[PDB]
Design an enzyme around this catalytic site. Structure first.
Site, PDB file in Angstrom:
ATOM      1  N   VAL A  26       0.547  -0.998   0.436  1.00 40.78           N
ATOM      2  CA  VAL A  26      -0.084  -0.117   0.208  1.00 40.78           C
ATOM      3  C   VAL A  26       0.358   0.881  -0.212  1.00 40.78           C
ATOM      4  O   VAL A  26       0.794   1.556  -1.028  1.00 40.78           O
ATOM      5  CB  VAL A  26      -0.540  -0.166   1.089  1.00 40.78           C
ATOM      6  CG1 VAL A  26      -2.005   1.240   0.977  1.00 40.78           C
ATOM      7  CG2 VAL A  26      -1.822  -0.928   1.394  1.00 40.78           C
ATOM      8  N   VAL A  34       3.807  -1.025   5.159  1.00 44.39           N
ATOM      9  CA  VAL A  34       2.678  -0.909   4.973  1.00 44.39           C
ATOM     10  C   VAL A  34       1.733  -2.190   3.905  1.00 44.39           C
ATOM     11  O   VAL A  34       2.614  -1.558   2.346  1.00 44.39           O
ATOM     12  CB  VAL A  34       1.017  -0.114   5.103  1.00 44.39           C
ATOM     13  CG1 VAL A  34      -0.131  -0.490   5.149  1.00 44.39           C
ATOM     14  CG2 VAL A  34       1.519   1.043   6.057  1.00 44.39           C
ATOM     15  N   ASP A 164      -3.125   6.603  11.740  1.00 45.83           N
ATOM     16  CA  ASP A 164      -2.196   6.339  12.594  1.00 45.83           C
ATOM     17  C   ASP A 164      -1.912   7.687  13.729  1.00 45.83           C
ATOM     18  O   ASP A 164      -2.037   8.513  13.092  1.00 45.83           O
ATOM     19  CB  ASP A 164      -1.068   6.350  11.395  1.00 45.83           C
ATOM     20  CG  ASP A 164      -0.869   5.003  10.450  1.00 45.83           C
ATOM     21  OD1 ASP A 164      -1.820   4.893   9.434  1.00 45.83           O
ATOM     22  OD2 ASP A 164       0.062   4.596  10.471  1.00 45.83           O
TER      23      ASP A 164
HETATM   24  C1  LIG Z   1      -8.446   0.435  -1.101  1.00 48.66           C
HETATM   25  N1  LIG Z   1      -8.241   1.154  -0.411  1.00 48.66           N
HETATM   26  C2  LIG Z   1      -6.863   2.046  -0.433  1.00 48.66           C
HETATM   27  O1  LIG Z   1      -6.513   2.488  -1.490  1.00 48.66           O
HETATM   28  C3  LIG Z   1      -6.004   2.399   1.216  1.00 48.66           C
HETATM   29  C4  LIG Z   1      -6.299   1.823   2.391  1.00 48.66           C
HETATM   30  C5  LIG Z   1      -5.579   2.685   3.702  1.00 48.66           C
HETATM   31  N2  LIG Z   1      -5.920   1.800   5.015  1.00 48.66           N
HETATM   32  N3  LIG Z   1      -6.793   1.401   6.013  1.00 48.66           N
HETATM   33  C6  LIG Z   1      -6.565   1.286   6.810  1.00 48.66           C
HETATM   34  C7  LIG Z   1      -5.058   1.797   6.556  1.00 48.66           C
HETATM   35  C8  LIG Z   1      -4.489   1.555   8.055  1.00 48.66           C
HETATM   36  C9  LIG Z   1      -3.217   2.331   7.300  1.00 48.66           C
HETATM   37  N4  LIG Z   1      -2.455   2.331   9.050  1.00 48.66           N
HETATM   38  C10 LIG Z   1      -2.301   0.773   9.925  1.00 48.66           C
HETATM   39  C11 LIG Z   1      -2.332  -0.258   9.416  1.00 48.66           C
HETATM   40  F1  LIG Z   1      -2.192  -0.352   7.821  1.00 48.66           F
HETATM   41  C12 LIG Z   1      -2.524  -1.368  10.273  1.00 48.66           C
HETATM   42  C13 LIG Z   1      -2.420  -1.199  11.526  1.00 48.66           C
HETATM   43  C14 LIG Z   1      -2.704   0.123  12.357  1.00 48.66           C
HETATM   44  C15 LIG Z   1      -2.441   1.178  11.381  1.00 48.66           C
HETATM   45 CL1  LIG Z   1      -2.494   2.654  12.575  1.00 48.66          CL
HETATM   46  C16 LIG Z   1      -2.223   2.902   6.316  1.00 48.66           C
HETATM   47  C17 LIG Z   1      -1.371   3.614   6.848  1.00 48.66           C
HETATM   48  O2  LIG Z   1      -1.604   4.516   7.065  1.00 48.66           O
HETATM   49  C18 LIG Z   1      -0.925   5.212   5.654  1.00 48.66           C
HETATM   50  C19 LIG Z   1      -3.225   2.680   5.464  1.00 48.66           C
HETATM   51  C20 LIG Z   1      -4.560   2.119   5.562  1.00 48.66           C
HETATM   52  C21 LIG Z   1      -5.199   4.399   3.038  1.00 48.66           C
HETATM   53  S1  LIG Z   1      -5.730   4.607   1.302  1.00 48.66           S
END
Ligand SMILES: CNC(=O)c1cc(-n2ncc3cc(Nc4c(F)cccc4Cl)c(COC)cc32)cs1
Ligand SMILES: CCCCCCCCO[C@@H]1O[C@H](CO)[C@@H](O)[C@H](O)[C@H]1O
Ligand SMILES: CCCCCCCCO[C@@H]1O[C@H](CO)[C@@H](O)[C@H](O)[C@H]1O
Length: 348
Positions: A26, A34, A164
Site C-alpha cells: 500500500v 504497510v 495512524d
Molecule cells: C483501497 N484502499 C486504499 O487505497 C487505502 C487503504 C488505507 N488504509 N486502510 C487502513 C489503513 C491503516 C493504515 N495504518 C495501519 C495499518 F495498516 C495496520 C494497523 C494500524 C494502522 Cl494505524 C494505513 C497506513 O497509514 C497511512 C493505511 C490504511 C489507506 S489508503
C-alpha cells in the site's frame, strides 16, 4: 500459534500467519511499511503494518510500546481499531518484529479530494465523523498530533476512520500542523488537532490545500497571511522579548475575512472554520463543542457520540532500559484479544 510464511515485497521481508494472503504494498513510510492483504479467516481485506526496527534504540522501543498501547485502547467507529497483533517470534529472546492489522479502508482523503468535488452535505458528514472520533480520542487525554488527509480513510458509504497517530513527544507533511507545534511551544492543547481539522475542512470545501508551505518558515508565512499577525491578547502570553520584537517587526497583517476567503461555501461552514483556525489555541473550539455546531445539525446525536475508557499513559514518564520496553511490548502482544465478529457478519 499459527504457521507463518515469509515473502519479499519492495525489498522488505514480511513474515505473517498463513491466514493473510495476497499481500500487496500500500505504501512505505516513516511510520512503517504497510501492505494490503486478504484475511482468509474472515473474508475481509486488511491493512498490515510492520513496525520498522522496533527496538533499535530506547526512543524507538518506547515509541513501539506507545503505538501498541494506543492502538489497543482505541475502540470507536471512527478510529482505527486493531483486528490482530502478532510477531513471528516464539519467545521474548527472539522478539524483534511487531505487526499490526486493521480493516483495509477503500480510500484515503487525498484520493477523494482529487477524485470528486465534494458537496456541502459530504463535507458535513466527513468532518462530523472526524470530530466524533476526535471527541473520543481527546476524552482519553490523547492528542492525535497528525491528522491529515492520508491519515483519514473512508469506505464506499463515506464512513470514515482516523488512522495512524502522531508518535512524536517532547516524509511527514507540515501542511496540517498547528503553528505552535512548529514553534516549540511545548505544552500543547488538544486543540492542535482542531487546527488540523480546520485545514482539512478547508481543503474538502475548496479542493485546494489551505496552507501548502514549501518549508518550515513558508508554512508559518502562509498561516499568518490568513489569520493575521498575533493579537495583543496573544502577545501577552509570549515570554521572550526577542520573540515579541520579531513579531512586531513583521508587516502587520490583519486577519482575513473568511467569508471572502471561502466565498460560496455554506455560511455555517465558514463560521465553524473561523472557530477552528484561531491562532490562539486557548480560543479554538473543542471537538465536543464543534459537534454541537449548527453545521452538523443533520448528523449530531448527543447520545451516540461516545467517549473512551480511561487510558493509563503513566509510562510516558518512565525512563526504562531498552530490555524493559521490549519486554512490556511483548506482554502487550501476548495479551491482545481480537474484537468479536460483528452481528451482521453472522447469520441465523
Ligand atoms: C483501497 N484502499 C486504499 O487505497 C487505502 C487503504 C488505507 N488504509 N486502510 C487502513 C489503513 C491503516 C493504515 N495504518 C495501519 C495499518 F495498516 C495496520 C494497523 C494500524 C494502522 Cl494505524 C494505513 C497506513 O497509514 C497511512 C493505511 C490504511 C489507506 S489508503
Ligand atoms: C522568533 C519569533 C518566533 C515566535 C515564536 C513564539 C515564541 C514561542 O515561544 C514559547 O513561548 C512560550 C511562552 O512564553 C514558552 O513557554 C516556550 O518555552 C517558548 O518556546
Ligand atoms: C506567535 C507565533 C505564531 C504562533 C501562535 C500560536 C499560539 C498558540 O496558542 C497558544 O497555545 C499554547 C499551547 O501550545 C498555549 O500555552 C498558549 O496559551 C496559547 O496562546
Amino acid at each position: 500459534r499459527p504457521t507463518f510464511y515469509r515473502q519479499e515485497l519492495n525489498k522488505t521481508i514480511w513474515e505473517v500467519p498463513e491466514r493473510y494472503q495476497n499481500l500487496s504494498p500500500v505504501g512505505s513510510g516513516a511510520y512503517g511499511s504497510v501492505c494490503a492483504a486478504f484475511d482468509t479467516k474472515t473474508g475481509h481485506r486488511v491493512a498490515v503494518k510492520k513496525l520498522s526496527r522496533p527496538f533499535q534504540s530506547i526512543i524507538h522501543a518506547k515509541r513501539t510500546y506507545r503505538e501498541l498501547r494506543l492502538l489497543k485502547h482505541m475502540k470507536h467507529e471512527n478510529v482505527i481499531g486493531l483486528l490482530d497483533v502478532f510477531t513471528p517470534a516464539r519467545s521474548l529472546e527472539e522478539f524483534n518484529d511487531v505487526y499490526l492489522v486493521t480493516h483495509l479502508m477503500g480510500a484515503d482523503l487525498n484520493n477523494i479530494v482529487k477524485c470528486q468535488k465534494l458537496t456541502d452535505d459530504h463535507v458535513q458528514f466527513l468532518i462530523y465523523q472526524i470530530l466524533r472520533g476526535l471527541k473520543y480520542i481527546h476524552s482519553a487525554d490523547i492528542i492525535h498530533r497528525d491528522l491529515k488527509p492520508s491519515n483519514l480513510a473512508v469506505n464506499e458509504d463515506c464512513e470514515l476512520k482516523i488512522l495512524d497517530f502522531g508518535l512524536a513527544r517532547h516524509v511527514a507533511t507540515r501542511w496540517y500542523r498547528a503553528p505552535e507545534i512548529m514553534l516549540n511551544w511545548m505544552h500543547y492543547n488538544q486543540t492542535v488537532d482542531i487546527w488540523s481539522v480546520g485545514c482539512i475542512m478547508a481543503e474538502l470545501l475548496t479542493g485546494r490545500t489551505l496552507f501548502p508551505g514549501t518549508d518550515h518558515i513558508d508554512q508559518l508565512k502562509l498561516i499568518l497571511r490568513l489569520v493575521g499577525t498575533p493579537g495583543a491578547e496573544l502577545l501577552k502570553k509570549i515570554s521572550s522579548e526577542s520573540a515579541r520584537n520579531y513579531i512586531q517587526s513583521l508587516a502587520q497583517m490583519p486577519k482575513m475575512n473568511f467569508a471572502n476567503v471561502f466565498i460560496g461555501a455554506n455560511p455555517l461552514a465558514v463560521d465553524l472554520l473561523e472557530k477552528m483556525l484561531v491562532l490562539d489555541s486557548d480560543k479554538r473550539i473543542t471537538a465536543a463543542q464543534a459537534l454541537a455546531h449548527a453545521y452538523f445539525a443533520q448528523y449530531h446525536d448527543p447520545d451516540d457520540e461516545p467517549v473512551a475508557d480511561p487510558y493509563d499513559q503513566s509510562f510516558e514518564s518512565r525512563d526504562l532500559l531498552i530490555d524493559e520496553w521490549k519486554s512490556l511490548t511483548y506482554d502487550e502482544v501476548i495479551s491482545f484479544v481480537p474484537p468479536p465478529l460483528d452481528q451482521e457478519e453472522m447469520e441465523s
